[PDB]
Amino acid sequence: QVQLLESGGGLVQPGRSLRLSCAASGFTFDDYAMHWVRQAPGKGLEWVSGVSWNSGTIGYADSVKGRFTISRDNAKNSLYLHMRSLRAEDTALYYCAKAVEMVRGLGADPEYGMDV
Amino acid sequence: VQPTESIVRFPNITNLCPFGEVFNATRFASVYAWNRKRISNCVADYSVL
């Protein structure tokens, strides 16, 4: 039973610092890659960030260069994303998930697999 | 009688610890987003170093 709990919602002002927490359960956490996906309200779904198995930041989106932070609490099986300098349109229905591909399975580190 | 030569024995070399591809990974992480893990139950060679 893989499970991901998302927190960090509510009414928040744009331009302010924000903390989002996703808790992972039902699967060994720190052997998989992991993804945050942006989803503007009233619009579609787009990739915003990710991080490797080794807790390595994949990078940041086009409009958010060098001002978000993605980190991984390996101790309590959790993941955090901090945002800064929000605007009205950086609002998104952010999603948390992992990667299907296992360590030492099928070169290079596999990081795709938008799965759960 | 005196002995001649020494013999040292041990079973086949078992599961090595996978140091290699931890350092041959696509990349390392940041300083605040730094990485740590713990290894046990495996043999470490140190010979490749």
Smallest Cα distance from A93 to chain B, Å: 25
- Separation CA A97–CA A90 (nearest Å): 20
The CATH superfamily assigned to A3-116 is Immunoglobulins (2.60.40.10)
Nearest to A92 by CA among A102, A81, A103: A81
Domain ranges of chain A: 3-116
Q: The tokens of A12 are what? A: 């928040």
Task: Report the residue of A55, A80, A109 to disrupt the B interface, i.e. the one with the largest count of B CBs within 10 Å.
Answer: A55
Method: cryo-EM
Pairing mode, strands A34-38 and A95-98: antiparallel
- Separation CA A21–CA A73 (nearest Å): 10
